[model samples]
Target: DMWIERTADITWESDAEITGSSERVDVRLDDDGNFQLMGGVLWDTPSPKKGDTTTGVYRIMTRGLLGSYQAGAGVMVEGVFHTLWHTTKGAALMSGEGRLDPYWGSVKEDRLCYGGPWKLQHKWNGHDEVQMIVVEPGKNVKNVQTKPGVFKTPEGEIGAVTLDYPTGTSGSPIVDKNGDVIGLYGNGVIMPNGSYISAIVQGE
Candidate 1:
């Protein structure tokens, strides 16, 4: 089994409200039993003369099954959620929020939230209409697919969606509904059997 580890240290520059900024750490076990560290800090300093700092850790494990995974194991902190994965297609990091929806059969109510330090990738399709790619962190690249319009997936249904560019394309930017970029191309997709498939197929 491949094991991975990560560690980092952060300091607040001035008196600020660390409303979101918090320290965190975590590890992920990939399909091949490989491990990857996915965690970070969310810090926010309010104006005036002071700020607060919070930190925590998170962990995810892949039990060598058909895209089956589990996440948890971290110190709960305010405003700062444990991130499970980050992609090169964009800087957006996925967190462990709203994971219990599936068990309660209320998946639709919980929506995935993207924190700062990243942006959403939006683009104009060939028709000049705005479209967005929904990325499910830790999922495969072939899992990324393009959608007809802006849409959100319910909790417990985080499968990768089509992106703007083809697999191996880099520097692709993810924008929001307002045509504002929320993230940059952080990585490319690697399809299985050297052929790419749509997100729907992978997710299914």
Candidate 2:
């Protein structure tokens, strides 16, 4: 079963300083009964300052099936946190400032979307627009079937869609016409070409 919960983290930069983290988490039980957690965790200082390390406890609370869970770990500057949790299959090693931005130049070169069970519409070549799956708080998932203009670029396959999302809507899945999770929504930008592009981060 799948449920929504709050994923919080409390980190100690040293023994004296404390930092906290929180984001709405999508938790679920996988095929094998293992708990799978999905969501974006915004850390105060995603990493330590240069030569320092931060220790923290990651916690997720759900009122259904899997009540809650926690784990402790020392996060390194490089291999610490992975943004926008993907398939949870790869050994994630990422670094970012937690600032969401639009598709500027290149798609993050690390992990491209593999052709998984879902039809990942990584290309915006000929299509001018696509539906955005929006799940607003306290409401059911709905599709915006019209209007947002998309930009096509051969330089990258990053889904540069156009959609206005509410606050804290990061990590929410966007789907294609077939109802497949094509990509996860990120920030947006109005390109010089007059097209407003909302960056879509696809899963691995």
TM-score for all predictions?
0.23, 0.36
lDDT of each: 0.24, 0.32
Question: Model 2 RMSD to the real structure?
Answer: 18.6
Off-target runs (Cα >4 Å) in candidate 1 are 1-38, 41-145, 148-155, 159-169, 186-189, 196-204
Worst 10 residues of 1 by lDDT: 101-110
lDDT of 2 by residue, 13-126 (tens): 122211111112223333332323332222232333121112211111123455532111111112132223322222222112222111111123212111112233343333
Runs in model 2 with CA error above 4 Å?
1-125, 147-154, 190-196
- Candidate number with greatest lDDT: 2
Worst 10 residues of 2 by lDDT: 70-79
Query: Candidate 2, overall lDDT?
Result: 0.32
